[PDB]
Amino acid sequence: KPLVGTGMERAVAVDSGVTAVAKRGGVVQYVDASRIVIKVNEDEMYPGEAGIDIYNLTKYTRSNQNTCINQMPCVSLGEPVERGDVLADGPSTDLGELALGQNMRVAFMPWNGYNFEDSILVSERVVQEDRFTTIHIQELACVSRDTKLGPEEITADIPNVGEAALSKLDESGIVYIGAEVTGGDILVGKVTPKGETQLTPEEKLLRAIFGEKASDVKDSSLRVPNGVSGTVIDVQVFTRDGVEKDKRA
Amino acid sequence: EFLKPRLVDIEQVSSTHAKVTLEPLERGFGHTLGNALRRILLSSMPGCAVTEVEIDGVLHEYSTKEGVQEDILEILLNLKGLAVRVQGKDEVILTLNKSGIGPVTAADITHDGDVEIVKPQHVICHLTDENASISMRIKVQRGRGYVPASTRIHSEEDERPIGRLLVDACYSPVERIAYNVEAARVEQRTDLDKLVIEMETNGTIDPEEAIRRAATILAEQLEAFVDLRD
Amino acid sequence: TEFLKPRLVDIEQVTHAKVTLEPLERGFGHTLGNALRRILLSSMPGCAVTEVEIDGVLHEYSTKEGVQEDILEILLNLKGLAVRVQGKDEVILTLNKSGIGPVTAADITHDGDVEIVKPQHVICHLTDENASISMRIKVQRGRGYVPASTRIHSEEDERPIGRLLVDACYSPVERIAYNVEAARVEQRTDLDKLVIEMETNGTIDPEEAIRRAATILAEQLEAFVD
Amino acid sequence: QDVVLGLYYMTRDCVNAKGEGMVLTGPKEAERLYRSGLASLHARVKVRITEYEKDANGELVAKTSLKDTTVGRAILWMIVPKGLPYSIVNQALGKKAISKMLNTCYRILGLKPTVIFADQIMYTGFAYAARSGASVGIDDMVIPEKKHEIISEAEAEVAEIQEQFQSGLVTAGERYNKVIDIWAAANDRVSKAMMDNLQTETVINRDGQEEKQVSFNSIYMMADSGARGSAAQIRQLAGMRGLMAKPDGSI
Amino acid sequence: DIVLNPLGVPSRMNIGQILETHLGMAAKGIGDKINAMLKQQQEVAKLREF
Amino acid sequence: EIKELLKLGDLPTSGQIRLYDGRTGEQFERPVTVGYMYMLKLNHLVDDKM
């Protein structure tokens, strides 16, 4: 919350649709981190065959800047809700108010030049407590086109790769759901057909010496961009109508 | 011709408060032992705190169990502030099973002799459905300082499961430490000071045991000056 | 639970040494740099002159006849006298000198209870025809530093008008200033590296001073540690 | 910007601080004398300092005397290299002085010491400005007490030139310009009634009477040292805030 | 928990922050006067008086 | 209206406390301001710029 607000905040976290504002007064009947069931009241109930109402929430989902936007219940079992009341927070709202950031004990003084220009110092009790830690939700797409040399595959077998990298992804090729990946791991095994080798003369002795079976298929899988690490929270598969669905699909 | 201080009464105001006093200080050593202790207690006291949680039917942190009314991302941010003091071993593996409608306080962890929870009135989550059921297996360790989950990954050694939810662990049993030297009075000495270290733990570590383990972290380190190697 | 102690404790020479030390634990670069620095500046047993008996003059804003500098300067030439005494605890020298030219400090008496360590440290420049300088300098051991302003204010050793009092610096040191700066142990960058830089007034070599100050400090921690 | 306020605080002088009038014995005793906690960082004192002076064909010479200074200026003298004279660190040492105190080290001692003397400044300004607590509050900016009367007189004195356009005693163009230059009178009797309340603000005592000095107002020190902003902006945090111009360019 | 610089207020004339920093301190002197009054569980008579 | 709220909280009316240094232990003369500003965190993160 803003410790020193200006009163014009409830009108900004309700007019925008981030909050799950209650639509008819009544009594909460079942809370949950993904659903709220508002037993409607008597007089605000429709003429015939009315019953009760129900609001769904929207758990972790990606906005346009790759931040997350998830909602949370802020009421328990038995609260009398009312018309225009609030049931769910959003991204940076608290109980209806609009809290954009955190408020922390500040002091004005020059300290050994570690705040020379406009710059700022920061205690380490603000990193431990994890108050400025935000969440980001990227997304990656691996399309398997239909080349004119034969089609690509999403097979989980990849040329000259060791099991240190094929550990996460199951046999169907796609990665698991929840496997903590880091920079350079593989997320989708995909190989593309390649001929027209015409390998050099010097190396063409290097093959005959050891027997390195040449590649029929080139490796063009989808590996995580460098410098990133986060649990793979969701996977979706789209298929052209007319090609079979593998088991993971 | 010097004086050396001795421990004195420990006004245990509350469970998390304390006031230990060091009676006979020679002049000039008031602020020298204080600030050389406040910078040790606040930094290097060995504590114990959760290391990694593991729930029954959830795969990652950003999930949402059915029946509870918190995302799993807040069940870990409530365990991290759990205070517990193991006596015998170095690490434990706690447990927690509960079913029914009602808040799951910390006091429902399975009881062991060595492990000894300190804040049993804690809250962990809520349950809001008669057929709901939560069952986790908390872990606990000893250490000091602060080691975020990202940097405790370099020593992963093939963390085979995908059900392990890693928490950041900030082991430290001290929160704020004041101190104020004041005019002590031996029977006949014109100027003798008194140190009053108004400590504040998280109910974990005894006060008199802190200072006897914050002095020997100093008195063990001054050796390298008592014998200058050249 | 099991800490880090320093190796590669290098020491330098110039009576002015610039010790160094590393790799201390993180944040230990200061609670060591300041525990010591508050001991060599505040309390350390030492001997230094305290009062002088100018044989003729009874007031500082007066003037001695024949002496080049005035007594507000001579006391400046006595406040920095480097004296060590093994046996006694209250020694009062005597300097009754004559001649003409720079009157060094080696013209004092040579009693078996004292041993100067800077005899050529000049005290006064005598004019011609006077050769009349005699004084009873008093040196008594003590700790730390005690100005002459906060003594006559509480005047208890009642002296007639003209028993000159000087600013006494008992400590054997003259300046000390640590300086922390980061280091590493080949896999961690949250380390330290202390850098002490010390001087003394002859009566104690520098590294010997740090040795007998990490001792006075590790004595106060005797009734706590195991 | 920040160092220059460090040094300005290090080399001022109060009027009666801890340990005034005592006589030190060089830069080395004048530092430890303040570290220990007896004397104040700016308290008038008498030290003895040997300066060098290259007067032959590139050779230095000593000259020991009894300079009359503060404790702050002595501590800053232990940084200056050899060839410079003590009348370089003896002023109040604002920002126009440091800018030249490096220049006179370039023209004399060349560029081996000046690159290593332009760092003992930065390591000293940053240090003695952090242990000085130069904060700023909402009562550092002192509104002058006579701001009302200065604003109400020209509030009435201009209500009686608008009348002189009622009865046509003056054309408008000699009504407009005669109303501008009456506010400029009041706009300048507020600056001159404010800065005289910040500059000589403090009044402390000797052992006897009281005698005034220059101030110690944390929003004046950042103006007088040129660290950031000057009286063209202090005049808006305490005084009256000018008269503005509409889009034409007219007042 | 933060150490801002005081040479930002004289030139840039935002004297908002130096006022939001005080009224943001009175409003957290209450939060420590109630958090103690509520930690000895005085009553629901002393709270309603404060 | 602010100063009358600090005085109810027992804080010092002027709004400036005396802070002690953290490393040495001595006290900053000429007291410092301490309040509760409300700090945002813009999304010009560093590991999307380098």
PDB file of C-alpha atoms in Angstrom, chain D:
ATOM      1  CA  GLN D   1      29.743  17.481  -6.562  1.00  0.00           C
ATOM      2  CA  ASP D   2      29.871  15.410  -3.379  1.00  0.00           C
ATOM      3  CA  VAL D   3      33.575  15.623  -2.589  1.00  0.00           C
ATOM      4  CA  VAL D   4      33.467  19.394  -2.927  1.00  0.00           C
ATOM      5  CA  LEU D   5      30.958  19.535  -0.093  1.00  0.00           C
ATOM      6  CA  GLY D   6      33.115  17.156   1.886  1.00  0.00           C
ATOM      7  CA  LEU D   7      36.078  19.502   1.778  1.00  0.00           C
ATOM      8  CA  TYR D   8      34.020  22.629   2.416  1.00  0.00           C
ATOM      9  CA  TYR D   9      32.819  21.036   5.632  1.00  0.00           C
ATOM     10  CA  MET D  10      36.312  19.912   6.546  1.00  0.00           C
ATOM     11  CA  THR D  11      37.895  23.347   6.216  1.00  0.00           C
ATOM     12  CA  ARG D  12      35.508  25.810   7.804  1.00  0.00           C
ATOM     13  CA  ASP D  13      35.741  27.010  11.384  1.00  0.00           C
ATOM     14  CA  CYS D  14      33.219  27.410  14.175  1.00  0.00           C
ATOM     15  CA  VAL D  15      33.646  30.086  16.845  1.00  0.00           C
ATOM     16  CA  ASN D  16      33.824  28.025  20.055  1.00  0.00           C
ATOM     17  CA  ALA D  17      34.216  24.288  19.552  1.00  0.00           C
ATOM     18  CA  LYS D  18      35.898  21.538  21.511  1.00  0.00           C
ATOM     19  CA  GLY D  19      39.563  22.251  22.087  1.00  0.00           C
ATOM     20  CA  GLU D  20      39.916  25.832  20.925  1.00  0.00           C
ATOM     21  CA  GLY D  21      43.157  27.735  21.253  1.00  0.00           C
ATOM     22  CA  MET D  22      45.328  24.728  22.026  1.00  0.00           C
ATOM     23  CA  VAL D  23      48.566  24.387  20.074  1.00  0.00           C
ATOM     24  CA  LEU D  24      49.333  21.228  18.121  1.00  0.00           C
ATOM     25  CA  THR D  25      52.637  19.881  16.808  1.00  0.00           C
ATOM     26  CA  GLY D  26      52.033  19.061  13.169  1.00  0.00           C
ATOM     27  CA  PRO D  27      49.558  17.379  10.847  1.00  0.00           C
ATOM     28  CA  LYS D  28      50.039  13.988  12.465  1.00  0.00           C
ATOM     29  CA  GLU D  29      49.004  15.005  15.964  1.00  0.00           C
ATOM     30  CA  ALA D  30      46.193  17.179  14.639  1.00  0.00           C
ATOM     31  CA  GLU D  31      44.541  14.148  13.048  1.00  0.00           C
ATOM     32  CA  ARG D  32      44.705  11.621  15.881  1.00  0.00           C
ATOM     33  CA  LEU D  33      43.681  14.441  18.209  1.00  0.00           C
ATOM     34  CA  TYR D  34      40.341  14.505  16.386  1.00  0.00           C
ATOM     35  CA  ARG D  35      39.961  10.783  15.773  1.00  0.00           C
ATOM     36  CA  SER D  36      40.199  10.116  19.509  1.00  0.00           C
ATOM     37  CA  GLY D  37      37.293  12.482  20.060  1.00  0.00           C
ATOM     38  CA  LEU D  38      38.690  15.468  21.935  1.00  0.00           C
ATOM     39  CA  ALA D  39      38.852  18.328  19.428  1.00  0.00           C
ATOM     40  CA  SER D  40      36.265  19.208  16.824  1.00  0.00           C
ATOM     41  CA  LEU D  41      36.861  18.945  13.108  1.00  0.00           C
ATOM     42  CA  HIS D  42      36.684  22.740  12.756  1.00  0.00           C
ATOM     43  CA  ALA D  43      38.016  24.444  15.870  1.00  0.00           C
ATOM     44  CA  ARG D  44      40.562  27.228  15.731  1.00  0.00           C
ATOM     45  CA  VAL D  45      44.016  25.985  16.725  1.00  0.00           C
ATOM     46  CA  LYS D  46      47.721  26.694  16.244  1.00  0.00           C
ATOM     47  CA  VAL D  47      49.799  24.051  14.480  1.00  0.00           C
ATOM     48  CA  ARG D  48      53.372  23.973  13.189  1.00  0.00           C
ATOM     49  CA  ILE D  49      53.717  22.985   9.550  1.00  0.00           C
ATOM     50  CA  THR D  50      56.818  22.721   7.374  1.00  0.00           C
ATOM     51  CA  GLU D  51      56.165  23.729   3.776  1.00  0.00           C
ATOM     52  CA  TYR D  52      58.545  23.225   0.883  1.00  0.00           C
ATOM     53  CA  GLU D  53      59.394  25.726  -1.820  1.00  0.00           C
ATOM     54  CA  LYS D  54      61.343  24.939  -4.992  1.00  0.00           C
ATOM     55  CA  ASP D  55      63.366  28.113  -5.477  1.00  0.00           C
ATOM     56  CA  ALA D  56      66.722  26.953  -6.840  1.00  0.00           C
ATOM     57  CA  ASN D  57      67.026  25.001 -10.091  1.00  0.00           C
ATOM     58  CA  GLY D  58      64.410  22.407  -9.136  1.00  0.00           C
ATOM     59  CA  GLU D  59      65.326  21.801  -5.487  1.00  0.00           C
ATOM     60  CA  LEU D  60      63.038  21.906  -2.461  1.00  0.00           C
ATOM     61  CA  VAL D  61      63.666  23.779   0.791  1.00  0.00           C
ATOM     62  CA  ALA D  62      62.022  23.551   4.204  1.00  0.00           C
ATOM     63  CA  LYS D  63      60.548  26.350   6.302  1.00  0.00           C
ATOM     64  CA  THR D  64      59.135  25.512   9.735  1.00  0.00           C
ATOM     65  CA  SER D  65      56.853  28.059  11.374  1.00  0.00           C
ATOM     66  CA  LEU D  66      53.686  28.414  13.466  1.00  0.00           C
ATOM     67  CA  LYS D  67      50.721  28.697  11.145  1.00  0.00           C
ATOM     68  CA  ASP D  68      47.406  29.752  12.677  1.00  0.00           C
ATOM     69  CA  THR D  69      44.713  27.493  11.303  1.00  0.00           C
ATOM     70  CA  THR D  70      41.940  25.081  12.241  1.00  0.00           C
ATOM     71  CA  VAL D  71      42.123  21.397  12.988  1.00  0.00           C
ATOM     72  CA  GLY D  72      40.397  20.677   9.703  1.00  0.00           C
ATOM     73  CA  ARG D  73      42.896  22.400   7.451  1.00  0.00           C
ATOM     74  CA  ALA D  74      45.844  20.633   9.086  1.00  0.00           C
ATOM     75  CA  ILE D  75      44.395  17.183   8.378  1.00  0.00           C
ATOM     76  CA  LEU D  76      43.974  18.249   4.760  1.00  0.00           C
ATOM     77  CA  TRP D  77      47.585  19.412   4.650  1.00  0.00           C
ATOM     78  CA  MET D  78      48.864  15.859   4.966  1.00  0.00           C
ATOM     79  CA  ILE D  79      47.602  15.178   1.429  1.00  0.00           C
ATOM     80  CA  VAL D  80      49.088  18.077  -0.541  1.00  0.00           C
ATOM     81  CA  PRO D  81      52.399  17.170  -2.204  1.00  0.00           C
ATOM     82  CA  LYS D  82      55.640  18.899  -1.352  1.00  0.00           C
ATOM     83  CA  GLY D  83      56.087  21.905  -3.611  1.00  0.00           C
ATOM     84  CA  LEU D  84      52.889  23.763  -2.724  1.00  0.00           C
ATOM     85  CA  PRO D  85      52.500  26.624  -0.220  1.00  0.00           C
ATOM     86  CA  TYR D  86      50.236  26.551   2.808  1.00  0.00           C
ATOM     87  CA  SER D  87      48.215  29.525   1.605  1.00  0.00           C
ATOM     88  CA  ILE D  88      46.511  27.051  -0.747  1.00  0.00           C
ATOM     89  CA  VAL D  89      44.592  25.041   1.879  1.00  0.00           C
ATOM     90  CA  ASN D  90      44.041  27.904   4.305  1.00  0.00           C
ATOM     91  CA  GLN D  91      41.003  29.578   2.754  1.00  0.00           C
ATOM     92  CA  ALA D  92      37.477  28.265   3.229  1.00  0.00           C
ATOM     93  CA  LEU D  93      38.077  25.983   0.216  1.00  0.00           C
ATOM     94  CA  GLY D  94      34.887  26.105  -1.794  1.00  0.00           C
ATOM     95  CA  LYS D  95      34.620  24.780  -5.353  1.00  0.00           C
ATOM     96  CA  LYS D  96      36.380  27.576  -7.214  1.00  0.00           C
ATOM     97  CA  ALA D  97      39.405  26.976  -4.991  1.00  0.00           C
ATOM     98  CA  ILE D  98      39.793  23.229  -5.482  1.00  0.00           C
ATOM     99  CA  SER D  99      39.510  23.795  -9.222  1.00  0.00           C
ATOM    100  CA  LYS D 100      42.714  25.833  -9.089  1.00  0.00           C
ATOM    101  CA  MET D 101      44.470  23.896  -6.302  1.00  0.00           C
ATOM    102  CA  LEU D 102      44.845  21.166  -8.910  1.00  0.00           C
ATOM    103  CA  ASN D 103      45.905  23.679 -11.542  1.00  0.00           C
ATOM    104  CA  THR D 104      48.785  25.053  -9.499  1.00  0.00           C
ATOM    105  CA  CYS D 105      49.877  21.466  -8.977  1.00  0.00           C
ATOM    106  CA  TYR D 106      50.008  20.870 -12.714  1.00  0.00           C
ATOM    107  CA  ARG D 107      52.041  23.952 -13.612  1.00  0.00           C
ATOM    108  CA  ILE D 108      54.579  23.250 -10.863  1.00  0.00           C
ATOM    109  CA  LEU D 109      54.936  19.559 -10.085  1.00  0.00           C
ATOM    110  CA  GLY D 110      53.946  18.142 -13.456  1.00  0.00           C
ATOM    111  CA  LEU D 111      51.682  15.180 -14.030  1.00  0.00           C
ATOM    112  CA  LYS D 112      53.216  12.414 -11.933  1.00  0.00           C
ATOM    113  CA  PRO D 113      51.906  13.875  -8.637  1.00  0.00           C
ATOM    114  CA  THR D 114      48.813  15.661  -9.895  1.00  0.00           C
ATOM    115  CA  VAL D 115      47.188  12.433 -11.064  1.00  0.00           C
ATOM    116  CA  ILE D 116      47.946  11.024  -7.607  1.00  0.00           C
ATOM    117  CA  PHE D 117      46.911  14.231  -5.836  1.00  0.00           C
ATOM    118  CA  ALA D 118      43.579  14.328  -7.665  1.00  0.00           C
ATOM    119  CA  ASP D 119      42.769  11.067  -5.889  1.00  0.00           C
ATOM    120  CA  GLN D 120      43.717  11.764  -2.306  1.00  0.00           C
ATOM    121  CA  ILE D 121      41.119  14.512  -2.666  1.00  0.00           C
ATOM    122  CA  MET D 122      38.408  12.131  -3.809  1.00  0.00           C
ATOM    123  CA  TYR D 123      39.296   9.655  -1.072  1.00  0.00           C
ATOM    124  CA  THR D 124      39.151  12.490   1.464  1.00  0.00           C
ATOM    125  CA  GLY D 125      36.089  14.404   0.347  1.00  0.00           C
ATOM    126  CA  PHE D 126      34.080  11.202   0.224  1.00  0.00           C
ATOM    127  CA  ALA D 127      35.259  10.226   3.691  1.00  0.00           C
ATOM    128  CA  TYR D 128      34.805  13.438   5.672  1.00  0.00           C
ATOM    129  CA  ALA D 129      31.465  14.195   4.047  1.00  0.00           C
ATOM    130  CA  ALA D 130      30.010  10.837   5.073  1.00  0.00           C
ATOM    131  CA  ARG D 131      30.885  11.221   8.750  1.00  0.00           C
ATOM    132  CA  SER D 132      29.416  14.711   8.740  1.00  0.00           C
ATOM    133  CA  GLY D 133      25.774  13.883   8.088  1.00  0.00           C
ATOM    134  CA  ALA D 134      25.001  16.627   5.621  1.00  0.00           C
ATOM    135  CA  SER D 135      21.267  16.018   5.568  1.00  0.00           C
ATOM    136  CA  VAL D 136      18.440  18.346   4.564  1.00  0.00           C
ATOM    137  CA  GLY D 137      15.019  18.811   6.117  1.00  0.00           C
ATOM    138  CA  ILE D 138      11.832  20.857   5.829  1.00  0.00           C
ATOM    139  CA  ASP D 139      13.064  23.409   8.361  1.00  0.00           C
ATOM    140  CA  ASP D 140      16.486  24.030   6.883  1.00  0.00           C
ATOM    141  CA  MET D 141      14.876  26.476   4.446  1.00  0.00           C
ATOM    142  CA  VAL D 142      14.050  29.455   6.650  1.00  0.00           C
ATOM    143  CA  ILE D 143      11.207  31.646   5.407  1.00  0.00           C
ATOM    144  CA  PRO D 144      11.897  35.291   6.317  1.00  0.00           C
ATOM    145  CA  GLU D 145       9.555  36.775   8.889  1.00  0.00           C
ATOM    146  CA  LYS D 146       9.070  40.078   7.041  1.00  0.00           C
ATOM    147  CA  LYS D 147       7.815  38.362   3.913  1.00  0.00           C
ATOM    148  CA  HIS D 148       4.256  39.425   4.693  1.00  0.00           C
ATOM    149  CA  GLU D 149       4.790  43.177   5.025  1.00  0.00           C
ATOM    150  CA  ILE D 150       6.986  43.183   1.938  1.00  0.00           C
ATOM    151  CA  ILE D 151       4.180  41.479   0.016  1.00  0.00           C
ATOM    152  CA  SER D 152       1.268  43.424   1.464  1.00  0.00           C
ATOM    153  CA  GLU D 153       2.708  46.890   0.863  1.00  0.00           C
ATOM    154  CA  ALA D 154       3.242  46.182  -2.830  1.00  0.00           C
ATOM    155  CA  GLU D 155      -0.136  44.465  -2.593  1.00  0.00           C
ATOM    156  CA  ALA D 156      -1.616  47.849  -1.668  1.00  0.00           C
ATOM    157  CA  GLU D 157       0.848  50.141  -3.458  1.00  0.00           C
ATOM    158  CA  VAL D 158      -0.223  48.510  -6.737  1.00  0.00           C
ATOM    159  CA  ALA D 159      -3.924  48.699  -5.913  1.00  0.00           C
ATOM    160  CA  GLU D 160      -3.373  52.480  -6.017  1.00  0.00           C
ATOM    161  CA  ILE D 161      -1.904  52.597  -9.499  1.00  0.00           C
ATOM    162  CA  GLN D 162      -4.817  50.633 -10.954  1.00  0.00           C
ATOM    163  CA  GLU D 163      -6.852  53.571  -9.643  1.00  0.00           C
ATOM    164  CA  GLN D 164      -4.607  55.982 -11.574  1.00  0.00           C
ATOM    165  CA  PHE D 165      -5.885  54.184 -14.684  1.00  0.00           C
ATOM    166  CA  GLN D 166      -9.481  54.528 -13.493  1.00  0.00           C
ATOM    167  CA  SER D 167      -9.389  58.330 -13.621  1.00  0.00           C
ATOM    168  CA  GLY D 168      -7.126  58.350 -16.674  1.00  0.00           C
ATOM    169  CA  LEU D 169      -4.162  59.953 -14.932  1.00  0.00           C
ATOM    170  CA  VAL D 170      -1.891  57.572 -16.882  1.00  0.00           C
ATOM    171  CA  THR D 171      -2.083  55.673 -20.148  1.00  0.00           C
ATOM    172  CA  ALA D 172      -2.031  51.892 -19.955  1.00  0.00           C
ATOM    173  CA  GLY D 173       1.525  51.474 -21.239  1.00  0.00           C
ATOM    174  CA  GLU D 174       2.607  53.631 -18.318  1.00  0.00           C
ATOM    175  CA  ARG D 175       0.256  51.563 -16.172  1.00  0.00           C
ATOM    176  CA  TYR D 176       1.676  48.181 -17.155  1.00  0.00           C
ATOM    177  CA  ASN D 177       5.358  49.080 -16.836  1.00  0.00           C
ATOM    178  CA  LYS D 178       4.621  50.967 -13.641  1.00  0.00           C
ATOM    179  CA  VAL D 179       3.125  47.796 -12.159  1.00  0.00           C
ATOM    180  CA  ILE D 180       5.982  45.557 -13.277  1.00  0.00           C
ATOM    181  CA  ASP D 181       8.747  47.634 -11.720  1.00  0.00           C
ATOM    182  CA  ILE D 182       6.893  47.849  -8.407  1.00  0.00           C
ATOM    183  CA  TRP D 183       6.848  44.062  -8.056  1.00  0.00           C
ATOM    184  CA  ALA D 184      10.528  43.948  -8.991  1.00  0.00           C
ATOM    185  CA  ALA D 185      11.010  46.145  -5.943  1.00  0.00           C
ATOM    186  CA  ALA D 186       9.213  43.579  -3.792  1.00  0.00           C
ATOM    187  CA  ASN D 187      10.791  40.631  -5.576  1.00  0.00           C
ATOM    188  CA  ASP D 188      14.210  41.989  -4.615  1.00  0.00           C
ATOM    189  CA  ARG D 189      13.383  42.978  -1.040  1.00  0.00           C
ATOM    190  CA  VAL D 190      12.615  39.309  -0.404  1.00  0.00           C
ATOM    191  CA  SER D 191      15.889  37.854  -1.648  1.00  0.00           C
ATOM    192  CA  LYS D 192      17.701  40.588   0.259  1.00  0.00           C
ATOM    193  CA  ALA D 193      15.520  39.777   3.273  1.00  0.00           C
ATOM    194  CA  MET D 194      16.178  36.025   3.002  1.00  0.00           C
ATOM    195  CA  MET D 195      19.890  35.632   2.238  1.00  0.00           C
ATOM    196  CA  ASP D 196      20.659  37.975   5.119  1.00  0.00           C
ATOM    197  CA  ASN D 197      18.811  35.443   7.277  1.00  0.00           C
ATOM    198  CA  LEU D 198      20.709  32.392   6.015  1.00  0.00           C
ATOM    199  CA  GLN D 199      24.243  33.796   5.721  1.00  0.00           C
ATOM    200  CA  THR D 200      24.800  35.268   9.183  1.00  0.00           C
ATOM    201  CA  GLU D 201      22.160  32.958  10.630  1.00  0.00           C
ATOM    202  CA  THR D 202      23.920  31.377  13.567  1.00  0.00           C
ATOM    203  CA  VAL D 203      25.006  33.313  16.634  1.00  0.00           C
ATOM    204  CA  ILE D 204      27.147  31.411  19.118  1.00  0.00           C
ATOM    205  CA  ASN D 205      29.062  32.628  22.139  1.00  0.00           C
ATOM    206  CA  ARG D 206      32.677  33.046  23.090  1.00  0.00           C
ATOM    207  CA  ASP D 207      33.491  32.489  26.756  1.00  0.00           C
ATOM    208  CA  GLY D 208      31.899  35.898  27.317  1.00  0.00           C
ATOM    209  CA  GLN D 209      29.423  37.612  25.006  1.00  0.00           C
ATOM    210  CA  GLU D 210      27.765  36.387  21.808  1.00  0.00           C
ATOM    211  CA  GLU D 211      29.225  37.022  18.359  1.00  0.00           C
ATOM    212  CA  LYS D 212      27.771  35.986  15.033  1.00  0.00           C
ATOM    213  CA  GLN D 213      29.406  34.100  12.189  1.00  0.00           C
ATOM    214  CA  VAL D 214      28.567  32.392   8.920  1.00  0.00           C
ATOM    215  CA  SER D 215      25.843  29.799   9.117  1.00  0.00           C
ATOM    216  CA  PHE D 216      25.664  26.020   9.166  1.00  0.00           C
ATOM    217  CA  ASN D 217      22.397  25.577   7.313  1.00  0.00           C
ATOM    218  CA  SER D 218      22.529  22.407   5.216  1.00  0.00           C
ATOM    219  CA  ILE D 219      20.696  24.117   2.329  1.00  0.00           C
ATOM    220  CA  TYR D 220      23.117  27.043   2.400  1.00  0.00           C
ATOM    221  CA  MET D 221      26.288  24.967   2.442  1.00  0.00           C
ATOM    222  CA  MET D 222      25.257  23.259  -0.788  1.00  0.00           C
ATOM    223  CA  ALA D 223      24.848  26.723  -2.330  1.00  0.00           C
ATOM    224  CA  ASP D 224      27.985  28.430  -1.075  1.00  0.00           C
ATOM    225  CA  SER D 225      30.342  25.610  -1.997  1.00  0.00           C
ATOM    226  CA  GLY D 226      28.925  25.422  -5.499  1.00  0.00           C
ATOM    227  CA  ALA D 227      28.257  21.735  -4.928  1.00  0.00           C
ATOM    228  CA  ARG D 228      24.761  22.026  -6.366  1.00  0.00           C
ATOM    229  CA  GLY D 229      22.644  25.041  -7.230  1.00  0.00           C
ATOM    230  CA  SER D 230      22.942  28.639  -6.062  1.00  0.00           C
ATOM    231  CA  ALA D 231      20.928  31.634  -4.870  1.00  0.00           C
ATOM    232  CA  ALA D 232      18.900  31.707  -8.090  1.00  0.00           C
ATOM    233  CA  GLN D 233      17.207  28.582  -6.714  1.00  0.00           C
ATOM    234  CA  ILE D 234      17.428  29.099  -2.964  1.00  0.00           C
ATOM    235  CA  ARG D 235      15.332  32.163  -3.723  1.00  0.00           C
ATOM    236  CA  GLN D 236      12.468  29.857  -4.732  1.00  0.00           C
ATOM    237  CA  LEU D 237      12.560  27.411  -1.833  1.00  0.00           C
ATOM    238  CA  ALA D 238      12.333  30.191   0.755  1.00  0.00           C
ATOM    239  CA  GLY D 239      11.757  33.541  -0.936  1.00  0.00           C
ATOM    240  CA  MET D 240       9.094  34.597  -3.406  1.00  0.00           C
ATOM    241  CA  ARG D 241       8.965  32.661  -6.644  1.00  0.00           C
ATOM    242  CA  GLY D 242       9.494  35.285  -9.357  1.00  0.00           C
ATOM    243  CA  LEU D 243       7.028  36.416 -11.999  1.00  0.00           C
ATOM    244  CA  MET D 244       6.314  34.223 -14.991  1.00  0.00           C
ATOM    245  CA  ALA D 245       5.969  34.806 -18.729  1.00  0.00           C
ATOM    246  CA  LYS D 246       2.963  33.724 -20.785  1.00  0.00           C
ATOM    247  CA  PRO D 247       3.381  32.083 -24.213  1.00  0.00           C
ATOM    248  CA  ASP D 248       4.003  35.285 -26.200  1.00  0.00           C
ATOM    249  CA  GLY D 249       7.161  36.153 -24.317  1.00  0.00           C
ATOM    250  CA  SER D 250       5.394  38.812 -22.230  1.00  0.00           C
ATOM    251  CA  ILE D 251       5.374  39.120 -18.449  1.00  0.00           C
TER     252      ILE D 251
END
